[PDB]
């Protein structure tokens, strides 16, 4: 009789923690799979990740899955040491991976610069604004101001010259997966307080380790736990909520009584479902704005074994390509990550071939595959990431819903929230908690 909206991992996780305090829970999935945003598909030729793939041990919650479902071991590192080219000044530059990281290492330091004040716990981002916070009444100030201000900007502020702007530029189109230019510095600030302050851990965390059977490994192994099948092809239209209960109305018209809701829809797709009452000003100005999430990944094919690593500026079509396997037909698969998912045409061997032939001439791509999340209507994004503004005033507004309408997901979490599998572990299991708490 708690009603969870949606099988990804925040819902999953959020399921096998009810059932362990013996609450009733039902999962309704809009797809006819599991997974969410998280999805491994065979594609050209062996599984790939169409959404989530790398995972760390200093990620709390998605180490815990990996070590309980049997994967401890079963972690690769992505191909490194490649061939790094990066697009400065409409002109290709080419270099080692290493040249590439020590200019990224140089604006990092800058990025994260008041980390420490901020965030001496990564966990509570949001310290400065609260009344424990007894720093000095400049530091807040900062922290208010950074929110305003984008991670390029920084950068650019410290007198870095044009090829490590144009580094930066290319590094948060993949990392904000859109346009950095509108993206809330803080985030960048928080990942570095969760790496240590340090690029390469940073990296390590977010970009180095793959799971070898996929992120479907961990969300088949939740969904296998749980004793009340999920019920697919089930989309939410309507959720009533109120102090002692709520209910749930499918689209097909069905009516499910429920003691109270989980939904873990993301800010993309939240407008498919209507909320009685209304969601909160604050939340609804940000399902209106939306995240800065607007990007996409691809996965490219090339003739030939080749370690390559290109970056590229905004407007390019892919600002991060990265060798990620060598099969077997001598051809390479790449990952890339672009800003807009309007301009690129993930199944297009044509667009992947402008792609390609942004560092390079002679490389000839054979295939490509993704899925754009930003038009899927049950996702209506990629991973959540932050506008100017929604760091203090985005993501945090969702706890408080009033009653017992629960919003749970990595676009919520208080740690690695949204970029990882982690922030969907996090909030979908406590939230869960939130919802025991509330019935004891
Ligand atoms: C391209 C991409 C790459 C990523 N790479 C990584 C990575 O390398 N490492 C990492 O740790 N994380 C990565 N992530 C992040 C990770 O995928 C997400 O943080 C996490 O999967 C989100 O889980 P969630 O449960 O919060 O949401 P979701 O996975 O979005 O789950 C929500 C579920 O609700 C369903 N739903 C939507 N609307 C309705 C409705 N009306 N009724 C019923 N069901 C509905 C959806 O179909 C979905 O199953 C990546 C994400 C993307 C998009
Ligand atoms: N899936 C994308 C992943 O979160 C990513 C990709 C490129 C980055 O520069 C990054 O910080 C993160």
Known sequence: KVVIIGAGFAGLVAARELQTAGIEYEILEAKDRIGGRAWTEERMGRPLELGATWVHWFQAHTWTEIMRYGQRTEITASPSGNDAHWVTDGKVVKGTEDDLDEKLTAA????????????????????????????????????????????IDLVKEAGFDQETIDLVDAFWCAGYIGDPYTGSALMAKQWGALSDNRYRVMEDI?????????????????????????????????????????????????????????????????????????????????????????????????????????????????????????????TTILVGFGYDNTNIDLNSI??????????????????????????????????????????TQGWSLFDDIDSQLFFAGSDYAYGWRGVCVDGALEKGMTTARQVINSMR
């Not at 970009?207 to 019920?231: F, V």
């Not at 402008?354 to 002679?362: G, P």
Request: charged letters at 25%; proline letters at 5%.
């Open 206 to 330: 977010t970009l180095k380790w793959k799971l070898n059977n996929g992120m479907r490994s961990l969300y088949d192994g939740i969904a296998g736990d749980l004793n009340t099948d999920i019920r697919l092809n089930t989309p939410v239209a309507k959720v009533e909520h109120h102090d002692n209960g709520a209910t749930v109305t499918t689209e097909s018209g069905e009516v499910i009584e429920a003691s109270a809701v989980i939904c873990t829809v993301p800010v993309g797709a939240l407008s498919n479902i209507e909320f009685s009452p209304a969601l909160p000003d604050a939340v609804q100005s940000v399902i209106d704005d939306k995240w800065n999430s607007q990007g996409a990944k691809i996965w490219i094919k090339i003739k030939g074994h080749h370690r390559f690593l290109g970056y590229a500026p905004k407007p390019a079509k892919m600002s991060v390509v990265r060798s990620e396997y060598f099969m077997d037909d001598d």
């Open 350 to 391: 044509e667009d992947a071939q402008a792609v390609i032939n942004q560092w390079r001439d002679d490389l000839e791509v054979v295939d490509t595959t993704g899925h754009n999340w930003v038009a899927d209507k049950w996702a209506g994004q990629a991973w959540g990431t932050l506008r100017k503004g929604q760091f």
């Open 108 to 151: 990092m330091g800058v990025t994260y610069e008041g980390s420490e004040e901020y965030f001496p716990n990564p966990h509570d981002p949001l310290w400065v604004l609260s009344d424990d916070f007894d720093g000095p009444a400049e530091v807040r100030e900062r922290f208010l101001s950074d929110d305003q201000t984008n991670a």
